Design a protein around this nucleic acid. Structure first.
Lengths: 146, 131, 227, 293, 242
RNA sequence: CCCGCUACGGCGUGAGCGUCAAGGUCUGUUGAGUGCAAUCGUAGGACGUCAUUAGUGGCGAACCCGAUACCGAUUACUGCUGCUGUUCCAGC
């Protein structure tokens, strides 16, 4: 028996909270309007400090004790706002439900978190993420060509 | 062709030392609920506070607590975790969980409240079997 | 057409064909002292079984009348019978006096040293000892006292009397606890009682003279906590 | 039968002197463990590796089972064992295990570093491995090393009373205990209560629920307190009183005298046990054929 | 393919006129529902039982899927259904079902009363039962009123969008939802997103984890979200067509 | 090496062949095939064992997880089967 850990891919999506300005109805246009950008003060340690505080205030102490045994952020870059969280296979339910209840960062509010891909290895999650981003480039290129 | 587990009973006994405290202080019924919500608020968060439990057959530092089956240990790990402090009693207290059963058959005294609780449970079990 | 081929992988191959198929006079005795000792301990058990048969034929429960009955009616059968009444003073006095000399057990008991005494008992031989099965994995082995005629590697050989039984008793050591009393010369005031475990040492006395015993996993000793 | 083998003694250094209030507090918590129910208690004492060990024989142990706990035993009806956890971090000049081991009953260790954890499992003759659950795990626990150590003997020990101390310590405690249960392959797990007060005591069915919520099964938990707890007591008890599990000075009676159970009937002065003449070679045969006992 | 069937319409009374900001906010939150990736959308509208129902045929529904949402139906690639939850407390000024079921598609109810639960299980041929997860539990959930209603065909609905409103409301939400789970026998549980803003929409992986940790197994949750949701949609559609 | 232009070695195409070289690649990967190392969760029914206060409840274990495949040997545990040895109890 080895370390059977599960990696979880999450993406930060910003909904277009603007009631005074009109909106355009299309597929890749709303992908552009939701996948805009990450703000300035976003790093690995900031997301970890926010998710530990959400783990404390939402799930408690002993739930945070079970979660924070192998709770690390393995890969994250602010240019694309996609991150990979390592966790146990038993508390993967707890980690995904903690990712769901992420309300706001302490600096920037008005954002939702999308958990997309869960697997027991990071190499297949990277392969699925490249194919998903390739599909995003296909939708962008189809709406850009016409 | 089976039977779904409705809930499970839990037999608690508040073991309180420092006999001056045991003779002076007297825990009333609201203190039980406040301390159990504080215990589920310290070690657990919102979901651990939202565990459904009601009070049945409360005696002098003696409690029977019904908790749903799918979160049984979720209850019984926290009761042995939290220590009472700064809630109307100067000294902390200890908790002894005496026995656990899922089949309604416990024998405490020859008191008549247990037969009434058994009749209340059978009035629901007949509706479970018929409807 | 399944992967699990029962007839093909075992019965019909050339590697597992060897496996069972899926359709299916005085000089000659004492040449070796060990084999003569084995013949003696077999002859004592056979003579004890014949003694039990002749004792049921006698229909007398007294053993002192039984020995004289065998002396009167069965001379050749009496020749290989043990003599426990002779066996007790010829062994116990020598064993107790040897332990009183070796472990420096004298009238002055307040200068005793236990660790060196246990080391001497680890260095002393148990040939000729009175020893008692006090705890065992088998419930029938306990309660047996007996004097050593020979030390084996993993079994133990004693002799005990019953009403009429005089059988050489072999007892396993793997999973048994043994005890022996060391008396002191004062009468009913103080005496010592030591214990060994036969599962812990599993070697010859020849190797036991040289071996320095070390720690073990000791996981199979749960019976000593159990009973 | 239940064994609680990690009750700490309120002293860390030999220069400090224990006040009577801590002794009365230990008497009250032993009465607490006798009140609801337990069977065995082995009280623990902590020393460091870089301290100056005294060159004494009858002063190594400030435990005093005979004078104060011998008076507590008659109203209690239980027994106490004295044990040392060795706080070893670096291979320094201090090595006096031949006296500290033979003075006490159970020998434990508390490693902090990499090489110390290896030389404890390899060469150091101890009984239990305790880790600092209050602080971080040193690097990592490997499978085949801990497995070979359990196959050699020494088991791992989990202190569920250390989580009752603070709020922040619970996360590090669970992060240590899950790794211990994972890397130990659920063979060598002995649990104990590290409480300094009677106000942090629990019942069997709550500790069982704690072990359930940590990740180890329930039948394996009660088996760890029945089989695994009382055997590692017997290991050190036979190693330090008797020879290296070879020849024992403990009387094997029927159901009353045992090396574990009959501590008071053994003269703890040096080794011996004064037993009356219960074995007579003259007129005693088979056990079922006797008439006098 | 997923069904989200609990999106509220920003209007409570027929006298109040919907402003231009509320329609744009609804377009925002439905585009946010399609952004994470959904298939069916059934937007909900709230009425009181003390409110006097209008005697009209083509004016019962102030939703107008055809003129406003008929463009987004063609552009985005989804579809809309209209449904009504009934805030019923007392049996007075009511008992009319033959007209409101023909205009709208799915008929739901909101009992907050002890006798209201009985009159909902007795004489209301409705699709789903909704409880107030925001406020407190009415009296006590039992197996007697639930098992007679789930076996008839009426499903029980959990609103995971009401949990992202306040901090104090989350405790009462969990206490209501776990009561519904222990009383429902893990069979008739349909879940929906009660979001009024686009900041409160979640995806299947987080919501499935939520309902899994609240007490429903992973088989029953996904099996419900597919089969029972698309079955009660066809139940409403065949009550419309046949 | 064959075709066309040009003619001192030349140039353009065949999704043609032979030799040589290159830490460019090897899911070219296997009725499991990963390589920061997947081998799942739940519900219902059938069978076996053990304990019951009305008839149900608990359990299907332990060792260990490969890294191309195969075979033989050794070591860790459960159950069945044959043999041997020991102890205890009687049928005459």
């Amino acid at each position: 028996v080895r370390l059977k850990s599960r990696y979880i891919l999450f993406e930060i999506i910003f909904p277009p909270t603007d009631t005074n300005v009109e909106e355009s109805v299309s597929k890749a246009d709303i992908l552009l309007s939701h996948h805009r950008a990450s703000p300035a003060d976003v790093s690995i340690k900031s997301i970890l400090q926010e998710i530990r505080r959400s783990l404390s205030l939402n799930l408690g102490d002993y739930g945070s004790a079970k979660c924070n045994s192998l709770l690390q952020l393995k890969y994250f870059s602010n240019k694309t706002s996609t991150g990979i969280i390592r966790c146990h296979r038993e508390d993967c339910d707890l980690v995904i439900m903690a990712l769901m209840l992420m309300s706001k960062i302490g600096d920037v509010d008005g954002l939702i978190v999308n958990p997309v891909k869960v697997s027991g290895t990071i190499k297949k999650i990277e392969q699925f993420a490249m194919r998903r981003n390739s599909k995003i480039l296909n939708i962008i290129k189809c709406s850009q060509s016409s | 062709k089976k039977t779904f587990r409705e809930w499970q009973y839990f037999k608690l006994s508040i073991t309180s030392f420092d006999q001056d405290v045991d003779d002076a202080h007297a825990i009333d019924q609201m203190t039980w609920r406040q301390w159990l919500n504080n215990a589920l608020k310290r070690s657990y968060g919102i979901f651990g506070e939202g565990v459904e439990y009601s009070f049945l057959h409360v005696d002098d530092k003696l409690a029977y607590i019904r908790v749903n089956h799918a979160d049984k240990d979720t209850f019984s790990s926290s009761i042995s975790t939290y220590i009472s402090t700064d809630e109307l009693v100067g000294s902390p207290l200890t908790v002894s969980i005496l026995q656990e059963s899922s089949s309604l058959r416990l024998l405490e005294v020859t008191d008549d409240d247990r037969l009434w609780l058994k009749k209340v449970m059978e009035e629901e079990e007949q509706d479970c079997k018929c409807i | 057409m399944d992967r699990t081929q029962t007839f093909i992988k075992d019965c019909l191959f050339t590697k597992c064909l060897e496996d069972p198929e899926k359709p299916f006079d005085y000089q000659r005795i004492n040449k070796n002292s060990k084999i003569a000792l084995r013949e003696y301990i077999n002859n004592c058990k056979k003579n004890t079984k014949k003694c039990l048969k002749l004792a049921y034929e006698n229909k007398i429960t007294d053993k002192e009348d039984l020995l004289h009955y065998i002396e009167e009616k069965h001379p050749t059968i009496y020749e290989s019978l043990p003599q426990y009444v002779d066996f007790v003073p010829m062994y116990k006095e020598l064993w107790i006096n040897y332990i009183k000399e070796l472990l420096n057990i004298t009238k002055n008991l307040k200068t005793f040293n236990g660790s060196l005494a246990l080391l001497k008992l680890s260095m002393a031989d148990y040939n000729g000892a009175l020893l008692r099965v006090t705890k065992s994995k088998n419930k029938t082995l306990i309660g047996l006292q007996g004097i050593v005629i020979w030390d084996s590697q993993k079994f133990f050989i004693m002799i005990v009397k019953g009403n009429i039984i005089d059988e050489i008793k072999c007892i396993p050591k793997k999973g048994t606890v043994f005890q022996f009393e060391i008396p002191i010369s004062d009468d009913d005031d103080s005496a010592l009682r030591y214990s060994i475990l036969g599962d812990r040492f599993k070697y010859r006395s020849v190797d036991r003279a040289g071996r320095k015993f070390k720690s073990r996993r000791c996981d199979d000793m749960l019976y000593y906590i159990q009973n | 039968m239940l064994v609680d083998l990690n009750v700490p003694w309120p002293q860390n250094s030999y220069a400090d002197k224990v006040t009577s209030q801590a002794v009365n507090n230990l008497i009250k918590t032993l009465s607490t463990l006798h009140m609801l129910g337990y069977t065995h208690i082995a009280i623990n004492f902590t020393v460091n590796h870089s301290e100056k060990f005294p060159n004494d024989v009858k002063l190594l142990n400030p435990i005093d089972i005979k004078r104060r706990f011998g008076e507590l035993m008659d109203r209690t009806g239980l027994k106490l064992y004295s044990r040392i956890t060795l706080i070893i971090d670096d291979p320094s000049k201090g090595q006096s295990l031949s006296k500290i081991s033979q003075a006490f009953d159970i020998v434990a260790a508390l490693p902090i570093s990499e090489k110390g954890l290896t030389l404890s499992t390899t060469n150091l003759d101890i009984d239990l491995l305790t880790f600092q659950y209050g602080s971080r795990l040193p690097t990592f626990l490997k499978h085949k090393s801990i497995c070979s150590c359990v196959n050699r003997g020494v088991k791992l020990e989990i202190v569920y009373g250390y989580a009752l101390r603070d709020v922040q310590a619970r996360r590090q405690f669970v992060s240590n205990v899950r790794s211990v249960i994972r890397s130990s392959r659920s063979r060598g797990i002995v649990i104990g209560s590290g409480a300094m007060s009677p106000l942090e005591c629990r019942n069997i069915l709550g500790v069982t629920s704690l072990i359930k919520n940590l990740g180890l099964p329930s039948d394996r938990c009660s088996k760890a307190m029945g089989d695994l707890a009382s055997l590692v007591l017997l290991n050190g008890r036979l190693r330090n009183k008797s020879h290296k599990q070879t020849i024992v000075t403990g009387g094997g009676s029927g159901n009353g005298d045992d090396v574990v159970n009959d501590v008071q009937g053994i003269d703890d002065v040096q080794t011996i046990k004064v037993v009356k003449r219960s074995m007579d070679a003259e007129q005693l045969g088979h056990a079922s054929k006797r008439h006098k006992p």
